Amino acid sequence: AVSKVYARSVYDSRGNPTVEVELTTEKGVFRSIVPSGAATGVHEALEMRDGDKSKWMGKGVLHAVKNVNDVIAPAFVKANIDVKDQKAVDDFLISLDGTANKSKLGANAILGVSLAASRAAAAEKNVPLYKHLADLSKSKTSPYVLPVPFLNVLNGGSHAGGALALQEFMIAPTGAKTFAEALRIGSEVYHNLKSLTKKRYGASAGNVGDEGGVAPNIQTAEEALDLIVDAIKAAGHDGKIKIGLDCASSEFFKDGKYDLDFKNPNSDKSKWLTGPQLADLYHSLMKRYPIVSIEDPFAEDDWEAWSHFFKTAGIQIVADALTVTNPKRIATAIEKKAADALLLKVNQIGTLSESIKAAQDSFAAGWGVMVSHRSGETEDTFIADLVVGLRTGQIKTGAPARSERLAKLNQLLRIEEELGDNAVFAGENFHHGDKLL
Amino acid sequence: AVSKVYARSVYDSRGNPTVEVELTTEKGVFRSIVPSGGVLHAVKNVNDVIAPAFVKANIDVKDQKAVDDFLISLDGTANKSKLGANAILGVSLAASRAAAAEKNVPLYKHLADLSKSKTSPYVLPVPFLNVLNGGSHAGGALALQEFMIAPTGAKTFAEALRIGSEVYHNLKSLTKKRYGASAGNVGDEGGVAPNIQTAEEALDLIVDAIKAAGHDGKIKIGLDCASSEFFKDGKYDLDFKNNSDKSKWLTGPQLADLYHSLMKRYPIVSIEDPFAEDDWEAWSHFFKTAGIQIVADALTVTNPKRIATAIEKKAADALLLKVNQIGTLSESIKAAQDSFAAGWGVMVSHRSGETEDTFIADLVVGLRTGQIKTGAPARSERLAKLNQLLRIEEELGDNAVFAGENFHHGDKLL
Numbered sequence: 121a122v123s124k125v126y127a128r129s130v131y132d133s134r135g136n137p138t139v140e141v142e143l144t145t146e147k148g149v150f151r152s153i154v155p156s157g158a159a160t161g162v163h164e165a166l167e168m169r170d171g172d173k174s175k176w177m178g179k180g181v182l183h184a185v186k187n188v189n190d191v192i193a194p195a196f197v198k199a200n201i202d203v204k205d206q207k208a209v210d211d212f213l214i215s216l217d218g219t220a221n222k223s224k225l226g227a228n229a230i231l232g233v234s235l236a237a238s239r240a241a242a243a244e245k246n247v248p249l250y251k252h253l254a255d256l257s258k259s260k261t262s263p264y265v266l267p268v269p270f271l272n273v274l275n276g277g278s279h280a281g282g283a284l285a286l287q288e289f290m291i292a293p294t295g296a297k298t299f300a301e302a303l304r305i306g307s308e309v310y311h312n313l314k315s316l317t318k319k320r321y322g323a324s325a326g327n328v329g330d331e332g333g334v335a336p337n338i339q340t341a342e343e344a345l346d347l348i349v350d351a352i353k354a355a356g357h358d359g360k361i362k363i364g365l366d367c368a369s370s371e372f373f374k375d376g377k378y379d380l381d382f383k384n385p386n387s388d389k390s391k392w393l394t395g396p397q398l399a400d401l402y403h404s405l406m407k408r409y410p411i412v413s414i415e416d417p418f419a420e421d422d423w424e425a426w427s428h429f430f431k432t433a434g435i436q437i438v439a440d441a442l443t444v445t446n447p448k449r450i451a452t453a454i455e456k457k458a459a460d461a462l463l464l465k466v467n468q469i470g471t472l473s474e475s476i477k478a479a480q481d482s483f484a485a486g487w488g489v490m491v492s493h494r495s496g497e498t499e500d501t502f503i504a505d506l507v508v509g510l511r512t513g514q515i516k517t518g519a520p521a522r523s524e525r526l527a528k529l530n531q532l533l534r535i536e537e538e539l540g541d542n543a544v545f546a547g548e549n550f551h552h553g554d555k556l557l
Numbered sequence: 558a559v560s561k562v563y564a565r566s567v568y569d570s571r572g573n574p575t576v577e578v579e580l581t582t583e584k585g586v587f588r589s590i591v592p593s594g595g596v597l598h599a600v601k602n603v604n605d606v607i608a609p610a611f612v613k614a615n616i617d618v619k620d621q622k623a624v625d626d627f628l629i630s631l632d633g634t635a636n637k638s639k640l641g642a643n644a645i646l647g648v649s650l651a652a653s654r655a656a657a658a659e660k661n662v663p664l665y666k667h668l669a670d671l672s673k674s675k676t677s678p679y680v681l682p683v684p685f686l687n688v689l690n691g692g693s694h695a696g697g698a699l700a701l702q703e704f705m706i707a708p709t710g711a712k713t714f715a716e717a718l719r720i721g722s723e724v725y726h727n728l729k730s731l732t733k734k735r736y737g738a739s740a741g742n743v744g745d746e747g748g749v750a751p752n753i754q755t756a757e758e759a760l761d762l763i764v765d766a767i768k769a770a771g772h773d774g775k776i777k778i779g780l781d782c783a784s785s786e787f788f789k790d791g792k793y794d795l796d797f798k799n800n801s802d803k804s805k806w807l808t809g810p811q812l813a814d815l816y817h818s819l820m821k822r823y824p825i826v827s828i829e830d831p832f833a834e835d836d837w838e839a840w841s842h843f844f845k846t847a848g849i850q851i852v853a854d855a856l857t858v859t860n861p862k863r864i865a866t867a868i869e870k871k872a873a874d875a876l877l878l879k880v881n882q883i884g885t886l887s888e889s890i891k892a893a894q895d896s897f898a899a900g901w902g903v904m905v906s907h908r909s910g911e912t913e914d915t916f917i918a919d920l921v922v923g924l925r926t927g928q929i930k931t932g933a934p935a936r937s938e939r940l941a942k943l944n945q946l947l948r949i950e951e952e953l954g955d956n957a958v959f960a961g962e963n964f965h966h967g968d969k970l971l
């Protein structure tokens with residue numbers, strides 16, 4: 121029985137406020153914290169900010185917090201809902217607001233309750249959270265599938281100061297045989313990368329971006345990728361580490377074209393790329409580098425560019441801003457053959473149940489699903505249990521630096537230990553971890 | 558009763574392995590993670606040695622003193638080098654968490670009980686936020702390690718963290734505007750990391766940030782010079798990361814004169830490790846007229862023998878408390894109690910290699926010290942402690958006070 125629902129303001133990993141929810145039951149007090157994006161898609165569910173210029177430069181969440189305490193909490197408590205019935209929980213929360221994008225109460229008001237309810241339910245059931253989430257999503261558990269971590273070891277775009285337009289350069293240790301192996305050897309590549317970046321581009325190029333990646337002041341995707349391959353090799357892991365990109369191309373889409381110098385206000389417009397031109401750039405990288413995944417290669421409503429590119433792509437293509445973890449937009453993407461993997465960000469849609477549905481829809485279409493952090497993250501480790509429960513085979517949750525990133529990666533170590541012989545590491549089958557064995 | 562003790566390797570905030578210990582009781586599983594400034598062996602020493610011995614012993618976890626005497630006597634080396642201070646600390650800390658859950662109390666209330674502190678009001682600390690990172694914590698020229706802001710003028714902890722975060726965000730934007738976008742990227746403890754060569758440059762930004770954010774008069778400054786890191790051939794190299802010109806290295810009185818000029822221009826209320834770690838004379842000399850809090854870190858390395866020496870020699874007036882240096886909770890408490898007894902302050906501190914563990918947040922409250930440093934308000938190995946303090950302040954309502962301008966003697970406040 122839920123006796124109390126309570127929200128407070130706490131700080132994310134960028135030092136900006138966000139919403140934390142505690143739900144109290146007979147089993148104790150369950151806490152969940154809402155993350156926050158920087159490269160948010162225009163179609164995301166509403167993140168409610170106070171806009172009081174006198175406090176946190178307008179970025180307060182006291183209104184969202186108030187909506188939990190004054191509106192969601194009494195309704196929830198009075199309703200006497202079975203927290204084990206997540207669909208009931210989320211149907212109820214969704215009905216409190218009654219707008220598709222949660223504009224009345226805020227996605228950041230609703231989500232903390234949704235997540236905390238799932239934590240309470242697992243406790244009531246005496247099971248680890250990942251087991252409960254497998255139950256909610258009707259996923260296979262014999263074996264569980266541990267994910268390949270896509271580690272964002274060099275940050276650019278909206279996540280780091282510097283000229284580099286592409287947002288994320290990730291290594292993926294698909295050749296590892298365990299999750300603990302994958303994390304160890306990924307951490308070794310990262311340390312090599314930091315040393316080498318500081319040898320090449322100066323000591324300050326080793327300071328980190330928002331997601332813990334090194335942030336050299338470079339201009340080209342090729343210079344980022346040459347550095348990463350040098351680190352893969354120097355660490356002794358050639359052949360066992362692949363690369364993923366998140367272009368976050370919506371961040372640099374202007375007036376039908378793509379500005380690869382978008383953080384320079386005097387960027388030369390005659391150098392901006394058309395869709396076809398950016399596709400040629402991708403194909404070039406794909407041919408020269410061990411790239412096995414590309415995320416948001418085109419902008420969030422540039423559907424024809426996605427569809428055209430996908431036709432000849434033949435590696436994993438991940439929809440992030442295109443789909444906003446929204447079953448409606450995923451349906452359109454599947455119809456158009458725009459991509460073949462979903463980036464699952466629970467706070468884009470705002471409930472656990474809608475997120476599970478979006479994963480289930482993706483799998484049903486033969487798509488992969490990469491569970492993801494936000495660039496504004498917290499000590500919360502929910503997504504570690506989520507990507508195991510959903511059996512997806514792949515997570516991105518930061519470089520192996522900054523503890524809003526390691527908190528999830530350490531939790532994955534703990535889950536792998538607990539599972540023992542009842543889990544397998546997805547390795548080279550990451551795209552379809554859900555069908556493995 | 559403790560039914561199980563288990564350790565494993567996890568990653569710290571720089572991506573380096575560290576020790577995590579879990580203690581299982583009837584109340585649940587209690588986890589402690591050790592910070593860092595060998596891991597395989599430490600984990601094995603927990604699983605093969607401490608774990609069977611501790612479980613067999615059936616020690617009362619609420620009796621922290623017995624827990625820690627058991628652990629020290631099991632190790633049997635003064636410096637805990639037989640089993641590893643990291644192996645020992647994980648079990649020490651986790652025992653305290655198990656003890657709180659048994660008592661049905663928050664951890665800080667339990668730690669106040671352990672240290673026999675006043676709970677009349679509890680004292681929330683001033684956060685010394687390391688907003689600009691230099692020295693060994695950041696790539697760049699800047700020699701001094703930490704440039705902290707201390708919101709001593711806030712009325713609550715919540716306020717302090719809010720206005721501190723506003724200053725930090727203003728700093729980042731001023732720094733990117735003035736030194737280029739790359740300069741706004743962060744060092745190990747979350748501070749911005751401009752490639753600058755002098756403390757005046759760094760301190761200039763901070764004062765501008767304080768002003769741009771609207772908080773002049775309410776934000777003071779603390780420094781961690783970590784001078785030992787650039788103490789070479791009897792002199793101080795303020796270009797130690799660069800071959801630095803040997804003719805520009807400063808003597809102690811030249812370094813002391815540097816500090817006085819900073820102290821005049823800037824609202825500095827604390828300086829840590831202004832001199833090298835075995836230069837007692839320089840410390841003792843500087844202190845006689847310093848007129849502000851002087852914090853001992855490398856000087857004392859949370860060791861009771863060197864702490865007693867520092868008190869006697871009157872080398873400083875505050876101890877930096879790093880639990881991982883001394884290796885048990887009981888000894889840390891004793892260290893802070895000896896400090897208070899001498900009329901010193903105690904600043905509870907993180908390590909540059911931190912984790913998601915929030916122990917030091919509960920510790921700073923339980924010890925009633927009035928001051929903590931646990932990073933910039935960026936990177937969640939720092940925010941996790943700062944967030945934990947928000948929760949504590951909120952929970953305590955009228956039963957808590959912010960140390961504010963009394964941070965030096967927080968333990969005596971109300």
Ligand SMILES: O=C(O)[C@@H](CO)OP(=O)(O)O
Binds near residue numbers: 157288331440492495
């Ligand atoms: O773009 C992404 O997929 C995410 C996390 O890397 O970034 P943000 O949180 O800024 O949208």
Ligand SMILES: O=C(O)[C@@H](CO)OP(=O)(O)O
Binds near residue numbers: 783906907908910
């Ligand atoms: O010098 C210090 O006070 C600490 C904390 O900032 O740093 P480190 O953990 O690197 O010793």
Ligand SMILES: [Mg+2]
Binds near residue numbers: 366368416440
């Ligand atoms: Mg993305």
Ligand SMILES: [Mg+2]
Binds near residue numbers: 783829830854855
């Ligand atoms: Mg120090």
Ligand SMILES: [Mg+2]
Binds near residue numbers: 709710960961962
């Ligand atoms: Mg005051």
